[PDB]
Design a protein around this ligand. Structure first.
Ligand SMILES: Nc1ccn([C@H]2C[C@H](O)[C@@H](COP(=O)(O)OP(=O)(O)OP(=O)(O)O)O2)c(=O)n1
Ligand SMILES: [Mg+2]
Ligand SMILES: [Mg+2]
Length: 903
DNA sequence: TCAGGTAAGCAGTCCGCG
DNA sequence: GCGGACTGCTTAC
């Protein structure tokens, strides 16, 4: 076995490292690491160390890390650059693991835990920890066991032991329905008192010390609550046993409004799953409660109980403990699906950072680039201070609002990273500048050629062509990984569609799902076998295919996110390689590329159609073009196609055989114009969109920038069994839009695009008539709630008070005095409802914590005073009015001369 | 909402617009 | 009532 680190820390002049040794065993060591830093030196001094610009450096080897840090300070005092890796544990990892790390996840202890705390007087604050911890469930990935620590005796009630037998039984049997597959994995430990529970928990923790520590809100709640509670009962030294090195730090996390505390446990890598989910899922959710996310991710029912959670232990200890166990399992279930832990480990070990640093793209890239440059004995520059300066980004074309019947789209592959590679944009590759013409002049190829020597961006920057910069080199490596995983994702997607087709004609038989790798396109043999399978086996295969697609999505999109993160890091003042010249070189080239190719595609299609000056490109955003294909379809004639799939094939062939070579010629010319190092502008066909053949559907529409809908039949080579709606920006896509309203607006759009005006009018009429029956939560708007205190003029709305904040203030007055009433949390999200005039709440709206039922203290009055009319107009009618006017449709049948009863 | 980036949409407040 | 200046929030990329 090749060795790999688990955790690394600097504590004074020592590195503390936990690691897996050559025999696969977990060990810990203290190393008195002597760091090196660098200073510029005269050419007269023979050296093997050079900075990124090729200037010679002397290496200074320090007696200890404190000496090195002090030297950095004195160098600032003198006014001289202190070069090298100033984060010493990153240098330590680089020296200790001077190879591509291969890690074995089976040896890494991943701990998932959740605690329960009964509190009669509101939310139990982690920084006070004034209430007993009465349950802990702690899952250990190495043991594959759920360790349950259950407090039987508390000042808030004495209870009986939890029953695994009742826990396993169905809810319909009066049981808790703890999943059958974890029942035999539960190790249950009841405790007479809290001191014994906590002492035993620490002994357990010492035996099975987490490397990766996760759960739901563990960083903001569970960890600080456990640490502070132990601290309160036993003292500080005992609480610090949560750290393998007995070192902890209270860390103050600042935001805009804006501060909270966490506990850093040295020698542990905390990856709170809520934060992993927020970074890696690419969702924006109305609520981030575990119940909400679990329901969204797994389609599992909410954990049902009677009364408040503050009385659950006393009234139903059995359910209390079962739900604590289930809470831990649901995070495991989400991860088995999303694979964010696996992703974090992959990224972390690739970069050679503390695993928790994956949350920082700057730290991630700083380490990758340092390791790369170190291999060539090059020396990284010192991070400098920079004022924050705004800079220009992408071009977005203003579309003409309209219906668009036949649409084909194209999108540049990893644009920004591709620009970096093509132009060779890097700190050490800057060759100089050239005199800029207006962007329009480059777009139209009338400007003077920037350089005959160097590779250029239209922002005025020139780059060397003799060798690749470190940024192009390293971005290429991660890009290639992304490309591989996207390949697996798309194959699984295509494979899913094959299964969906078979599900139309399932064989009536008893059989098993096929053992197949869904990351690769099914062979003919597999395809034949699939057509002979039962619906039960096919649905299981579909589930597996979709789980494979999810796994591939996680791996690809977040590698895409990482490489795009490097382009953005160049525009962040804290990045070691911050340079607005390089950040703007990328964005400005991107603007030119889009508009260059818009002109080229327009010219090509005008030529092939035998027309002049017509706009075929209807829209573009950053690196995409949307092309009107009406004229292409019309040249062969609607009536010449057998079915929808026939014209989809035609457009697919047209894109591949005609348009793609034209796009490529256009970009090859642009590459020569800018004298770039390597042509890397690859613009794959994305969507083929249109109405079903023979229908009255409109196919698509745009209302404005970043606001459109398309009926897609093929997306990047995935031919759908059923057409899929691609809706961007519209209210159906916004977490702020009520759930039921998203659903209704989506159906209106479906009818518009697939069936036509009449079908849309029928549905509108029905929804308008029935909507007052919808559950209040389904028709509540959602909003983040920041700056509640600012607009609070005890306790009424101050000047310019936002609508949702007014709602919260209404809520606060209506629950005033109640210690048990759920409190709106600053920075979190609320449901919002309008209130009818003359209501007992004294204002026009009310808001309460999102993902929850409004407290029974006021529920009936809210339900009675809900303004359904205002609700409908604001969330449904107004957006729909926007869709239909853009599409030139009416959602209500206009009067005609035919209106003499007989239609 | 600690944690790479910019562009740009819509809701709402305030208040002008004879 | 619509829209402009402005804040707040949320999306596309
Ligand atoms: N969060 C984001 C999203 C996008 N972009 C920029 C960089 C992208 O390269 C460009 C185009 O966005 P795409 O969504 O088309 O993503 P890519 O082109 O990078 O990848 P691909 O199109 O291959 O999926 O926009 C960004 O800086 N930050
Ligand atoms: Mg792209
Ligand atoms: Mg794009």
């Amino acid at each position: 076995m090749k060795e790999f680190y688990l955790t690394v820390e600097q504590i004074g002049d020592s590195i503390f490292e936990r690691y897996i040794d050559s025999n696969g065993r977990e060990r810990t060591r203290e190393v008195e690491y002597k760091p090196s830093l660098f200073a510029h030196c005269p050419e007269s001094q023979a050296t093997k160390y050079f900075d990124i610009y090729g200037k010679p450096c002397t290496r200074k080897l320090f007696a200890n890390m404190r000496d090195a840090s002090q030297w950095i300070k004195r160098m600032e005092d003198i006014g001289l650059e202190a070069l090298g890796m100033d984060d010493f544990k990153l240098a330590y990892l680089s020296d200790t693991y001077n190879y591509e790390i291969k890690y074995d996840h089976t040896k890494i202890r991943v701990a998932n835990f959740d605690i329960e705390v009964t509190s009669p007087d509101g939310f139990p604050e982690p920084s006070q920890a004034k209430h007993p911890i009465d349950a802990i469930t702690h899952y250990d990935s190495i043991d594959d066991r759920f360790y349950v620590f259950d407090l039987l005796n508390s000042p808030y009630g004495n209870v009986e032991e939890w029953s695994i037998e009742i826990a396993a039984k169905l809810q319909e049997q009066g049981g808790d329905e703890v999943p059958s597959e974890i029942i035999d994995k539960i190790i249950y430990m009841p405790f007479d008192n809290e001191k014994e529970l906590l002492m035993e928990y620490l002994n357990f923790w010492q035996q099975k010390t987490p490397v990766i520590l996760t759960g739901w809100n563990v960083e903001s709640f569970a960890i600080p609550y456990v640490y502070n509670r132990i601290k309160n009962i036993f003292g500080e030294s005992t609480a610090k046993r949560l750290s393998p090195h007995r070192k902890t730090r209270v860390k103050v996390i600042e935001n805009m409004y804006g501060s909270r505390e966490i506990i850093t446990l040295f020698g542990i890598s905390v990856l709170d799953y809520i934060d992993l989910y927020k970074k890696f899922s690419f969702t924006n959710q109305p609520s981030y409660s575990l119940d909400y996310i679990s329901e969204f991710e797994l389609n599992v029912g909410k954990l049902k109980y009677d009364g408040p959670i503050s009385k659950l232990r006393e009234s139903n200890h059995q359910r209390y403990i079962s739900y604590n166990i289930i809470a831990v399992y649901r995070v495991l279930q989400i991860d088995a699906k999303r694979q964010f832990i696996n992703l974090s480990l992959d990224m972390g070990y690739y970069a050679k950072i503390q695993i928790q640093s994956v949350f920082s793209p700057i730290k991630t890239w700083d380490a990758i680039i340092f390791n790369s440059l170190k291999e060539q004995n090059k020396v990284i520059p010192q991070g400098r201070s920079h004022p924050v300066q705004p800079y220009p980004g992408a071009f977005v074309k203003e579309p003409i609002p309209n219906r668009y019947k036949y649409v084909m789209s194209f999108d540049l592959t990893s644009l920004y990273p591709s620009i970096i590679r093509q132009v060779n944009i890097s700190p050490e590759t800057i060759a100089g500048t050239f005199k800029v013409a207006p962007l329009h002049d480059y777009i139209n190829a009338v400007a003077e050629r920037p350089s005959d020597v160097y590779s250029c961006s239209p922002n005025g920057m020139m780059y060397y062509k003799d060798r690749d910069g470190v940024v192009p080199t390293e971005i290429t490596k991660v890009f290639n990984q992304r490309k591989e995983h996207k390949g697996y994702m798309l194959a699984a997607q295509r494979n899913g569609e094959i299964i969906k087709e078979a599900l139309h004609n399932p064989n009536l038989s008893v059989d098993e799902p096929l053992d197949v790798d869904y990351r690769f396109d099914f062979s003919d043999e597999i395809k034949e076998k699939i057509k002979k399978l039962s619906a039960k086996s096919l649905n299981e295969m579909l589930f597996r295919a979709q789980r494979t697609e999810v796994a591939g999505m996680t791996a690809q999109i977040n590698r895409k996110a990482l490489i795009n993160g490097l382009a953005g890091a160049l525009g962040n003042v804290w990045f070691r390689y911050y340079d607005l010249r390089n950040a703007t070189a990328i964005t400005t080239f991107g603007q030119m590329a889009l508009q260059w190719i818009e002109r080229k595609v327009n010219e090509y299609l005008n030529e092939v159609c035998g027309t002049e000056g017509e706009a075929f490109v209807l829209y573009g955003d950053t690196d995409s073009i949307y092309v009107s294909a009406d004229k292409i379809i019309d040249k062969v004639g609607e009536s010449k196609f057998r079915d929808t799939n026939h014209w989809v094939d035609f457009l697919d062939k047209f894109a591949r055989e005609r348009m793609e070579p034209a796009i490529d010629r256009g970009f090859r010319e642009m590459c020569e114009y800018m004298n770039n190092k390597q042509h890397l502008m690859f613009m794959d066909r994305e969507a083929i969109a249109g109405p079903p053949l023979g229908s009255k559907g409109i196919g698509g529409f745009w209302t404005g920038k970043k606001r459109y809908a398309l009926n897609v039949w093929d997306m990047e080579g995935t031919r759908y069994a059923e057409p899929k709606l691609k809706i961007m920006g519209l209210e159906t896509q916004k977490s702020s839009t009520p759930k039921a309203v998203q659903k209704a607006l989506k159906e209106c759009i479906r009818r518009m695009l697939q069936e036509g005006e009449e079908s849309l009018q029928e549905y509108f009429k029905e929804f308008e008539k029935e909507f007052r029956q919808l559950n209040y939560i389904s028709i509540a708007s959602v909003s983040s709630a920041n700056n509640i205190a600012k607009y609070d003029v005890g306790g009424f709305p101050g000047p310019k008070c936002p609508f949702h904040i007014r709602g919260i203030l209404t809520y606060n007055r209506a629950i005033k005095g109640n210690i048990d009433a759920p409190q709106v949390v600053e920075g979190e999200k609320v449901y919002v409802l309008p209130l009818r005039e003359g209501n007992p709440f004294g204002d026009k709206c009310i808001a309460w914590p999102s993902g929850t039922e409004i407290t029974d203290l006021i529920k009936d009055d809210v339900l009675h005073w809900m303004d359904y009319t205002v609700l409908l107009e604001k969330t449904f009618i107004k957006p729909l009015e926007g869709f239909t006017s853009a599409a030139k449709l009416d959602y209500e049948k206009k009067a005609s001369l035919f209106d003499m009863f007989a239609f």
